[PDB]
Amino acid sequence: PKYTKSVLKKGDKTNFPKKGDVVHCWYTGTLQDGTVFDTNIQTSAKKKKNAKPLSFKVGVGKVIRGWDEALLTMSKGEKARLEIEPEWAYGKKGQPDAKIPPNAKLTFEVELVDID
Ligand SMILES: CO[C@H]1C[C@@H]2CC[C@@H](C)[C@@](O)(O2)C(=O)C(=O)N2CCCC[C@H]2C(=O)O[C@H]([C@H](C)C[C@@H]2CC[C@@H](O)[C@H](OC)C2)CC(=O)[C@H](C)/C=C(\C)[C@@H](O)[C@@H](OC)C(=O)[C@H](C)C[C@H](C)/C=C/C=C/C=C/1C
């Protein structure tokens, strides 16, 4: 796989998402030099899902390839760090209009909040 995952806080080890499911996630993304280019983790309130965690369906290509594959190995509660090679993120061109330089390897802390 072209990502690397380190478990930072262990999940419940029972509830894992399948390719069907909708996952609810908090995240922070940093570029190589350390600058966080995006987070949804909030210092005003979490409360109550204000603001709301990210939601998408796993395994169906709604998100970048690194996220899609890594979410399938996480259990509910798990906070993990993910280093994703450019090939499994925004690749050669990157996404300039969204702060992603060309050929950036990207590091994300991700936390699985809930699965339905
Ligand atoms: C302001 O914050 C943005 C998130 C930003 C966008 C730009 C990137 C730098 C970034 O900074 O986040 C970022 O941190 C990032 O790289 N992320 C977001 C967190 C998950 C991983 C990654 C990502 O894959 O983003 C995604 C990346 C940008 C796009 C994918 C790239 C690969 C390709 O396979 C996919 O095609 C399907 C599109 C953005 C998302 O996580 C959102 C949730 C999903 C989509 C937009 C698409 O799946 C779309 O499909 C048409 C949908 O079905 C959605 C649900 C439809 C509804 C109406 C739109 C919601 C839009 C929400 C946008 C949000 C909260």
Swiss-Prot record:
It is found in: Nucleus. Disulfide bonds: none annotated. GO terms for cellular component: nucleus. It catalyses: [protein]-peptidylproline (omega=180) = [protein]-peptidylproline (omega=0). Keywords: Acetylation, Isomerase, Nucleus, Phosphoprotein, Rotamase. The modification N6-acetyllysine is found at residue 62. GO terms for molecular function: FK506 binding; peptidyl-prolyl cis-trans isomerase activity; RNA binding; signaling receptor activity. The modification Phosphoserine is found at residue 44. Its EC number is 5.2.1.8. Residues 20-116 form the PPIase FKBP-type domain. Inhibited preferentially by rapamycin over FK506. Belongs to the FKBP-type PPIase family. This is Peptidyl-prolyl cis-trans isomerase FKBP3.
